Amino acid sequence: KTHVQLSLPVLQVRDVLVRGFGDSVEEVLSEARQHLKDGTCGLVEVEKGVLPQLEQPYVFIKRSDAAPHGHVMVELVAELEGIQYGRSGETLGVLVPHVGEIPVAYRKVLLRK
């Protein structure tokens, strides 16, 4: 399938134990997709002071469309030193590994895989 319905655990930035997916734009996008597939991916909602607490490169989920079965359609965009790789809509949050942190909510998304 080109798209997959996922329910992403929303984590508080100060709870996150593993604060990025790796060391290159290509690696973080790769790892993010693997974790999304394995159900081991969390979402941090971006506000003032969140991103500097996480590790670059960042992986964003961004709205790709204006929501089948409650699931907002999203795609992945990476960022490193203020350059983005991809072009998409509004940020829903930054993806991080989920290693058992207790979430505050779930974000239902339809991921272009």
For residue 57, say if its preceding peptide bond is cis, omega within 30 degrees of 0: yes
Nominal resolution (angstroms): 1.8
Contacts of 38 (CB under 8 A, 6+ apart): none
**Alpha-carbon distance values, 87 to 56, 67, 103, 106 (Å):** 18, 19, 28, 25
State the number of CA atoms in the 13 A half-sphere of 24 facing the CB. Answer: 3
Determine contact, residues 50/93, Cβ cutoff 8 Å.
Answer: no
| SS3 at position 74 | strand
Task: Report the run of H or E that residue 45 belongs to, with start and end.
Answer: none
Specify the experimental method: X-ray
Residue 104 CA to residue 81 CA, distance in Å, equals 29
Residue 41 CA to residue 28 CA, distance in Å, equals 12
**Alpha-carbon distance values, 82 to 9, 25, 79, 92 (Å):** 26, 12, 6, 18
Alpha helices per DSSP H over 1-113 = 25-38
